[PDB]
Structure formats: structure tokens, C-alpha cells
Design a protein around this nucleic acid. Structure first.
Ligand code: K
Ligand code: K
Ligand code: K
Ligand code: K
Ligand code: K
Ligand code: K
Ligand code: K
Ligand code: K
Ligand code: K
Ligand code: K
Ligand code: K
Ligand code: MG
Ligand code: MG
Ligand code: MG
Ligand code: MG
Ligand code: MG
Ligand code: MG
Ligand code: MG
Ligand code: MG
Ligand code: MG
Ligand code: MG
Ligand code: MG
Ligand code: MG
Ligand code: MG
Ligand code: MG
Ligand code: MG
Ligand code: MG
Ligand code: MG
Ligand code: MG
Ligand code: MG
Ligand code: MG
Ligand code: MG
Ligand code: MG
Ligand code: MG
Ligand code: MG
Ligand code: MG
Ligand code: MG
Ligand code: MG
Ligand code: MG
Ligand code: MG
Ligand code: NA
Ligand code: NA
Ligand code: NA
Ligand code: NA
Ligand code: NA
Ligand code: NA
Ligand code: NA
Ligand code: NA
Ligand code: NA
Ligand code: NA
Lengths: 30, 57, 93
RNA sequence: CCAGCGGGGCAAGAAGACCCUUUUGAGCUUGACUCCAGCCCGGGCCUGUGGGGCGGGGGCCGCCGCCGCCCCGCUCACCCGGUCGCGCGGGGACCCGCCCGGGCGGGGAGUUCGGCUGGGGCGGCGCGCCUGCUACACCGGACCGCAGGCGUCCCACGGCGGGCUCAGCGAGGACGGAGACCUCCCGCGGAGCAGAAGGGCACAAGCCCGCCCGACCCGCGCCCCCCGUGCCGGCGCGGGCCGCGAAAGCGGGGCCUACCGAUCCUUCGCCGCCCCGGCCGCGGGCGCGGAGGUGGCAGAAAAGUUACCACAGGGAUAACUGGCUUGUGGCCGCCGAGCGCCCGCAGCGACGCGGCUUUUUGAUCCUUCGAUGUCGGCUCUUCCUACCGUCCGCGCGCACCGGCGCGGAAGCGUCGGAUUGUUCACCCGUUCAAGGGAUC
RNA sequence: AAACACAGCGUCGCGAGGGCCGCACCCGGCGCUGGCGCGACGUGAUUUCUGCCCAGUGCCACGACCGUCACCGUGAAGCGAUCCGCCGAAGCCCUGGUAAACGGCGGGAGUAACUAUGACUCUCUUAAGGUAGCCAAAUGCCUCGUCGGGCAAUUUCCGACGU
RNA sequence: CUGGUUGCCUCCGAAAUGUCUCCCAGGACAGCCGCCGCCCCGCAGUUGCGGCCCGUAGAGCGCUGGCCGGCGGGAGCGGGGCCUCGCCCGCCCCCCAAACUCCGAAGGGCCGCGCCGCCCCGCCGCUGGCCUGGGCGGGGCGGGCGAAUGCGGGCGGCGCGUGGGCCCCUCCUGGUAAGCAGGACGGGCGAGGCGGGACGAUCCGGACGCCGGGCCAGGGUGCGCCGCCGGGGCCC
RNA sequence: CACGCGCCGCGGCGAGCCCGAGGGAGCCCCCGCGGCGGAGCGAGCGCGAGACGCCCCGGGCCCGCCAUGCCCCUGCGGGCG
RNA sequence: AGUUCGGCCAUCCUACGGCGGAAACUCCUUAACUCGUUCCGAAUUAAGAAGAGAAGCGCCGUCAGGCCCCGCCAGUACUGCGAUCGGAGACGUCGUGGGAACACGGGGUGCCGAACU
């Protein structure tokens, strides 16, 4: 019997097409 | 396409695999379904007994 | 089934037994300002057709009848539920 | 090794197109269910300038300002025609257009078209419950197993107290009879207790009479099914208020085992709380408990057809070979009631009983759906014997001729035609013409 | 190919401010047209004919406004949101018409001087009870129907017969 | 839903079942198993002794039903010739039942097998006519480990696979039967090497690290092919 | 591989803990808020915990929600049960 | 022995004959009162004391019916475990454990407890 708390995370949107909804932080020191 | 309806062929062997579990030793002294007037009297007699009363001072 | 016109029953408001008068209970008229009605009316606007299920597979032929009992000294209302029956008559005093 | 050949390599060629399943499709239909264009109909805006009628604000008279509907003019909006704008017309405040409302609407769009199941369909409903049996003496135990039942009925057919004893045998009374009613006797229940079946019950749980409404309110626990979850049903309790009885007591319906239903929504009832910058009145919401229903009964909102067709799979499942079985089909023994002029057995043999075969048809679903080419005929080979003619013996109700029965015997023979796809059947003819197997 | 077309036959709609169709809108086609026309359907040369049924479904009434059936408008009540009445277009309902519209077109008994059959009678019953014709037909299950022709011999073929 | 999914050794090791499901070629919860632990409180698929429960095999015809006859009595009734057989009453008798039982095994199931006895004292808001009871505690005295056999026990967390099974023995149901279909205690194959049964997933023995020696189960001992004689009886 | 949830092991600190974004010209140095934890229950107005204990289990009491009896101030408010 | 109240519920019941009463129980007598009968003082309620063992009741009897105990039935029927035992099967057998029923024969036929006379 699995006893877990249910997740409250939304499904991703626009992953292979559309606006770019991913922000990276590789430019933080710069 | 018909499949089997019922079998108890292997069930007795599975029951005995880890022995037949006995009940807990606290299930024998529960107050689960005892007569309320008896339970209330038992509570008051204990509390007024100086030798077994848990009231402070 | 036949039901007496008067019955001496427990009265909650006055806390004792008293005489009550028997009558028949019927469902009231549907209001247009109930929250569920408002939600349903909002959902049906525009294009799309029917948005909620419509029941159509009836099975039972009777209902559970309910008698209303009115206390004759304080106007306190009580209800009694009979079993399923096909016709019910309240005797007249 | 060669020329040939077509018995095998379930030869090759293609993730079976037949059949079934998948909460996989598409074409088409309609009195499936939910809708859309289009069209018809009404009012308002576009939209001017005049007159009149009717109906509403005992007799009317209304004020001429109130309300509705209706009708008739004019031209300037608006619209249509003729003309190379050469010497002019037609409609008209209606139509059209736009906004809102109602109707028609497979013309069109989207979607659905349950399950179990000795294949699927048709049929049936062990798809929610109850009694007895199957069931093999704790409990449990399967089938489209057997014989059946339920979705109701009752303010009395309910609660309590008192009194009484039922069905019936025997005997008697007589307009009175196989039965009406009356009386005595004995009566372990052979009667009755709402409906299935099984249990239970005699100064009663049955029948009659008296008074009543515990067929109530608040709150807990347990049993059955069982994952020790829900639902139906039952039982044990703590408080409140009541009924009957002299009282002890008993009573949360009809003696027990069946008779019924979540979330969301609606509706009703008591007492309270909220509407978040405050207060007041309406209104809305919330906590507790009932009712409105899902029978496919742990509970989607749902009609057909495809021989134009698909997709993914399935030997978990049909249609053709093979295998097990032999009811049915075919063949063969035993017995001896009788038939045979008399005479059971020359030849037959009823009523019964015992076997064999897989050349019929069923029953089953073991192998094969990434395919073993599915009827018959033609051609050609081989094999069986349960023998039709020919061979050798014996028997006869065998004078001869001709027939019939039995045993050994599978070498040879068992043909030509008309109609039918036919196997089969049926007829004509002749040297007079058995039956079968080998992936039917 | 027995399929489609076809000449012929018949029905239906429309007199222009109309009909049928296209089309997101603006605008188009028939139409350089006008009933001896245009459009929509069925049957399918000639000859001879084309029966009965309007209960069902469909269509049509310059038939009728009985009941029902919207918004708008208007009356009463209310603090107001609102609520209750009246008013009542088309449609349906109602009354009629229509089958060369879709389609449909019965049973059981008794009966004539041998037998047999049944012109005839009784009875139930429909909206109407299959008329003229034709047939074991490309349409008959039983069925390889019965009789005749043709063959030595015919589940084929032709001519008759027909609850 | 069909196909494929890449090094070694060691330690453990299944399920093909219950309920619900537009569920039936799938899932959830429970069962079976692995790993990780933690704690210190006697255990058992057994026999013996003691108490209680069940309505099966068999048996039987008292109850509910069914079914052959024989012989006696006749109040009443019928047939036929007060006579003669019938219905009725009694006895006797043949044969029966998954949904009959007065009786009733083998076989099963549940419970028990160490603390006991005496005296005194305390509390109760329960219970009694009372100085009654019941329950829960305290203090003194005496005594003691009272069937066999074997052997350490208990609890928690997280998680996987499985949810088409089949065969043997004995016991059953439907069917003419079936290598047919459906159930039950125990075992096996699945997932079990090796010898034998000529030949076989399951039968008879035996359950497995790599080797040398010995003994021998089951089955056999003319030759193929390791291994034999003696005695009694029968004999297509 | 990314994110979310459950449980297990290990490290640092501990009624506390914490390289947030960012700022100091030091990829590794210095400073750096929320948050989570610390008190629950109740639809809500709201009210609000000490009595025992190596550990575990169980009893006994206490807080909130529901219902009641007695007393009383500032009162449909307080206290005691 | 008698009566009232009981326990276990036939060795106590059923049928038919016989014996007995001093006390007790019972049967008996009356209907003013009380209460009563689908109608009836039958029952029941109230009030009595002339009769009686004729019943009920206690005891005895019956080649009695029933009920109860012992034997025999019979190690029979059936059955748990093991068997390459026989047989085509249906069924049977051996080893090792348990073990009936009907029928029939003999015998029997209420005790126990508390209060009063
Ligand atoms: K099958
Ligand atoms: K077709
Ligand atoms: K074949
Ligand atoms: K034979
Ligand atoms: K195939
Ligand atoms: K034409
Ligand atoms: K008509
Ligand atoms: K025809
Ligand atoms: K002829
Ligand atoms: K399932
Ligand atoms: K009997
Ligand atoms: Mg299954
Ligand atoms: Mg060739
Ligand atoms: Mg070949
Ligand atoms: Mg395939
Ligand atoms: Mg394919
Ligand atoms: Mg499915
Ligand atoms: Mg589709
Ligand atoms: Mg469609
Ligand atoms: Mg199905
Ligand atoms: Mg179920
Ligand atoms: Mg009574
Ligand atoms: Mg009470
Ligand atoms: Mg269900
Ligand atoms: Mg081939
Ligand atoms: Mg091939
Ligand atoms: Mg021969
Ligand atoms: Mg005719
Ligand atoms: Mg004809
Ligand atoms: Mg002809
Ligand atoms: Mg023909
Ligand atoms: Mg010919
Ligand atoms: Mg292991
Ligand atoms: Mg469902
Ligand atoms: Mg028996
Ligand atoms: Mg599976
Ligand atoms: Mg099988
Ligand atoms: Mg496997
Ligand atoms: Mg194994
Ligand atoms: Mg040798
Ligand atoms: Na919308
Ligand atoms: Na298509
Ligand atoms: Na129930
Ligand atoms: Na198969
Ligand atoms: Na064959
Ligand atoms: Na063939
Ligand atoms: Na023409
Ligand atoms: Na038709
Ligand atoms: Na082997
Ligand atoms: Na604790």
C-alpha cells in the first residue's frame, strides 16, 4: 500500500515549440 | 474465452508460512465495549484511594 | 396504507409528549438564486450544447412518503418517513 | 556429376482480407443525442409630414394631455426602371439592412452505439438480494447446476394486559341430506401466525376483548458480508419522554432468516454563525438531519449499417486436415416367443442382453491466424477386406436346370451412355457390374 | 451486361416586387431568358391497358383562429433587486383535399339424386380486402410438382395446369 | 497491444488466490517474498489427559412422501347373485428417497493442562432490608514449580514480482462418453539436476559446491548392454 | 536528465536553522530577508494545553469541538463540575 | 403422613381394575354484598359448614402400551493411514488404527429441599 501526499505541480507548457519558458542563470557572475 | 472461477488449492500452505499470528496481549483488557456504569465506578474508586490515586497532593 | 389524522408524539421544543396533526410533505419550488442554479446558468451560455448529464434510466416506481406533524401547542414541525407504498391516505378526524 | 521430373522439404511470394477482441477508426443511414448554416415569423432602430376609426382610462360625458391596435394620404429620406440624362417614369415611410426573440432544419458537424457467454449472434440473466439441495457431520467451497422467491402488503394484520384453545375422530339433535348450526368426549398441534422455503410456538408467538401509538428524541458500540472498507439488515447499551399492567415486567413495528442506494445539485426542518472599512433591513452562504436516484443495483448522459472498407493483435476463439470419444450411422455375436402343411434353428427369428469400427453426423477446442491454396471432375499409383463373379470344400425345404446358407481365398474383373457442378440419386444398354483408405 | 442513356408518356413549382441555385462579405448563374419558357422528379419505342384504399406517414389550404405557444409592451404589489397578471406572429393542434405521393390490397364452416367439386347460405372481420392479366418465369419452400411433346434412356428444354 | 532491451561471482526466493472495478488480453487493496532494522516478553501444521460441538457413511420406515401382495373383521356404502366380491378397520409382507430421519460412526473443530490456601485492612459517586455484594488495591503466614517430545521469541518501516496455471492420489457434479467441462484435503511440475520406467515437464527412487574411496534405493541380471544361481508348482 | 512526493542512511548545527535575490572589485573569501520549526482544534464567531514515565505498549488526567447541572462579578459574560 | 412453594423434567406418562381419609386437601351449600359471564354463579367473585369417599388425590395390580438400564446383534456394516496387491471394468483383498444401527433377550417403573400441621 502506497501512502503518499499528492503532488501539486503543474504540467509543463511549450516544451518543443512556442515561447521559450526556461531561464538559465549561467550569466550570474558576468 | 472462459478462465477459472475459484480455487483454494494453495491457501492453507500460504497461511502457515509464517505461523498463525496470535492477537496482541492488550486486546484482552480493552474497555472497548464494557458497561458504562461499571467503568465510571472503577474510575472514581481509584481516584479516591490514597494508595493508588494519581491526583497531585 | 392509511395514516391516523392525529398522533401523540414527543415534542422537541417543549420537551414532552403532545398531540400533533398529520399532513403530507411535497418538494418546494426551485429558486433561481441558488448558487448551483447560478453556476449552471452561467455554464450554459454561448455555444457548446448541453454541458451536464441528463438522467434517463429510471428503475423505481414508488417513493418514500413523508408525513409532516405539527405540534398543536407550539407550532413545532416534525417529520416521519414511511416505507415504500403505492398509495397513502390520511384519515379525516 | 548430367539430362529430365514435379512425391516431399507442413517449398517461395504478404506481420490472414474470413472469425473474435481492443473502452482503435473511417464511409453511409435515420423517428440515436448534442448542435450549426439557411430560411420563415414578430418587435425595435433606420424614419419624415398630415388625417381618421375602434377598444381600454342606469346612462354616459370623459380631460382633449392617459394607454393600446388599426386604416387612408403626401413627398423629402430610402429603393427600382428608361435614356448617349436630347425634351420621364414607378414605389414609398412600407420594404431592405442591423439588434433581440420564436419556429422549421441528416442540407451539414461532432460523438456514442454495455457485460456475462463450452466461438460470436439469437435466446437467458447466479449483473443487487433471500430459502432448501449440490457440499463428502467446525467454517469455507465452482458451473448458462437443481426446485423456487424479492423490488410489495398492513393505524392494524402494530404495543401491552387479561381470558381462552385449535384441526379433527366418535356419538347425539333434524324442515336437514356428502357438508349449515347445537351438545358431550378425547384431542403433542395433525390448525393458525401477509406472500418462497426452511425453522419456531399451547393457561402461547394462535383466537377474542380492553386501553394505547416504543411504527418516539439525543449519543455510542458490536455482529453478518469482509481487504476485517462501504451499503442493506440485526443486536447491546447510556440518557429524555411515554404506553399497558395490581405488580414483577415488557415495548426503537408485523416470530426468525429477503423486501433496497455515494460525491455534486435541489428542497425542507431546529438553533446559531459569516457577508472581511462600519451600522440597519431584505437576500445569499455555512455547521446538523431527512426527502428527490442512479435495478448494468461501489452509481458514464448515448441508435443502426458496411458484400467499398479498415488498424493493432489473437491459435487465450469459430470455419477446412489431424487427435481423444462413439450418442447417431455401419458391422457382428448370445438367447429362443414364434414363422416355416406338421417340424425353434434348410432359411428366418420378436422381447432382451454383449461387443467392434472410424468409410456418416454430432460433442470437445489439444496443434496451426508474421496464411499447411479451401468442392467436384480428369489423369495415375498403391493399399485394406467386413467377398459381388470367377477357384476349392460342406449344407439345403439340393431329382435336373436354377437358387439360398457357411468356411478358406484379395490373383483377375467390376463397363458404355441420357439429366444434374454435383458426391449421391435415377433410368437405358452390355460378358448383368462388392465396399472402402491414402492431409475427406 | 439484363446495368446507364434514349425518343415518348406523366406529375409538380413559378407571371419578375418571381422561382431555383451559388456565395465569408461585397456580389453572382439560369438570363443576349418570359409559360410552344425555365427548373424539379418518376416511368422508359410501338400495340392494348392502367382496378380498389386518404385509416398510417408525407404534402397542401387567399381554411379557421378553438387550445397552446416568445421577446417586446402594458397593469397591480414592492425599499429595491424582483414577482404576479394581461396581451398572443409564425408553428403545432382543429376542419377539409390529395395515391402516374411513400405505400397497402382477409379468415372459418356447411352445401347439387353414385362419387367428386361447389354456382349458393351462414359467420367473424378491414382503410381497402388483389380487378384485367400472367406463372414452378431471371420470381414456387415443399420440388427432381402433375400431365403432354421430344430421346433407347432427360434434376435440362418447350406446351398446359394453379388457394 | 506485438518485437527487442548489452560483464562476473555470492546470499535469499515467489505467485497463478480473496474483494471492487464499462471489469473479463488491464488495474487498486489484501495474501505470498526481499532488504533494512528494533526490542527482550517462552514457543509448536505433534501426541497424551480433561470438557464441549457437528448429523455425513451405515442403518431404518416412527415423521414427510412412495410402493407389491396375503389373511382376517365387518357398523356404513357400492357392484353382483338373504348371500358374494369391493371401499373402510386390524395384522403380516416385497422394495425405496440429493431437497425423509427415532438412531448414528470413522473423521474433524474449539477450550484447558500453575500458582495456590488462610487472615486482616482501605476506596467506590455502583449494588442490596442490613453489618449485603461486586470491583480495584495494600499488608502478614504456609507451600511450590506438578504430562511427553523438540526448540529462543516478538514487533515495525519501505518496496518488487504475481493476479491465463496444469498434473497425481482419494472424494464428487453435469454429460452416452471424452487426452471434455466444473469443485475438495495432501503432494508434485511450473521453478528440481541424477538412476530407472525402451521412448515422455508430472510415474518409481532420490532433491544438486569440486574431488578420491566404500555402502547400497528403485529397477533389473540369454546377447545387443553393466549384472545369477539354487529349490517347489504350472505351462499354446 | 529536470521537477514534485514518501521513506531510509550519513554530515553540520540545535529551540532553532538557512552559499535567497543582491552587495563588497577574490569561481572556492566576507555580509546577506522571507521561509520552515516552535500549539492545537474548530464550518465559523473563536477558544487554547502539565499529572504521572530509561525506552516501547497501555491506563490516567488536560485543550478544542457537542450536550448538560450548580454558583456569580463587568452578564446569551465569568467560574466550578 | 398431609399441605404451600420449588429443583431436575415419563423409572414420574397413558389405559383399565382395586384399596383408603382421624387431621389435611378435595368434592360440597348459598347469591344480600363484591365481581362476573358473545347468553348461563358452567367458569369466575363474594359468603358458608348439612353431607362424602362416589370422583380428583395417595397406594396396589396388569405374560399392559410407552419410557429407562444391561446383554446379544458383532468385531459384523462402515471407515482413517500404507500397498506395482487381484480385476477389462464394476468392484474386491492385505497390513496397521477406530468401530455402529435395527431387531431380539433379561430386568426396572421418581428422587431431592425449605416452611407449617
Ligand atoms: K470454450
Ligand atoms: K450491396
Ligand atoms: K488439407
Ligand atoms: K463381436
Ligand atoms: K492459419
Ligand atoms: K424522360
Ligand atoms: K392523410
Ligand atoms: K414469388
Ligand atoms: K413423355
Ligand atoms: K479482474
Ligand atoms: K413411513
Ligand atoms: Mg481469474
Ligand atoms: Mg517443372
Ligand atoms: Mg514438390
Ligand atoms: Mg496477424
Ligand atoms: Mg494484416
Ligand atoms: Mg475491456
Ligand atoms: Mg467515427
Ligand atoms: Mg451524421
Ligand atoms: Mg461480450
Ligand atoms: Mg458482488
Ligand atoms: Mg396470554
Ligand atoms: Mg430507557
Ligand atoms: Mg457494480
Ligand atoms: Mg504447401
Ligand atoms: Mg506456403
Ligand atoms: Mg475372412
Ligand atoms: Mg386473380
Ligand atoms: Mg406459379
Ligand atoms: Mg414451364
Ligand atoms: Mg428455369
Ligand atoms: Mg441435352
Ligand atoms: Mg534458498
Ligand atoms: Mg460503473
Ligand atoms: Mg445412506
Ligand atoms: Mg495476464
Ligand atoms: Mg484439460
Ligand atoms: Mg511462467
Ligand atoms: Mg518442487
Ligand atoms: Mg555383460
Ligand atoms: Na464558452
Ligand atoms: Na472510408
Ligand atoms: Na439484509
Ligand atoms: Na487451443
Ligand atoms: Na476420415
Ligand atoms: Na483433398
Ligand atoms: Na423529350
Ligand atoms: Na415496403
Ligand atoms: Na530422469
Ligand atoms: Na506515554
Amino acid at each position: 500500500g502506497r501512502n503518499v501526499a499528492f503532488s501539486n505541480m503543474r504540467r509543463y507548457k511549450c516544451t518543443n515549440k512556442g515561447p521559450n519558458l526556461i531561464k538559465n542563470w549561467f550569466n550570474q557572475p558576468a | 474465452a472462459k478462465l477459472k472461477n475459484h480455487t483454494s488449492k494453495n491457501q492453507n500452505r500460504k497461511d502457515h508460512r509464517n505461523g498463525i499470528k496470535k492477537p496482541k496481549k492488550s486486546a484482552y483488557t480493552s474497555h472497548k465495549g464494557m458497561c458504562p456504569k461499571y467503568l465510571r465506578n472503577l474510575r472514581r474508586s481509584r481516584a479516591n484511594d490514597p494508595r493508588q490515586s494519581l491526583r497531585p497532593n | 396504507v392509511t395514516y391516523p389524522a392525529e398522533r401523540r408524539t414527543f415534542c422537541k421544543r417543549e420537551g414532552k409528549h403532545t398531540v400533533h396533526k398529520a399532513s403530507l410533505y411535497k418538494k418546494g419550488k426551485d429558486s433561481l438564486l441558488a448558487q448551483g442554479k447560478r453556476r449552471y446558468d452561467r455554464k450554459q451560455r454561448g455555444f457548446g450544447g448541453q454541458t451536464k448529464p441528463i438522467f434517463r434510466r429510471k428503475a423505481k416506481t414508488t417513493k418514500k412518503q413523508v408525513i409532516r406533524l405539527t405540534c398543536s401547542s407550539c407550532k413545532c414541525q416534525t417529520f416521519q418517513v414511511l416505507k415504500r407504498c403505492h398509495r397513502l391516505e390520511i384519515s379525516r378526524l
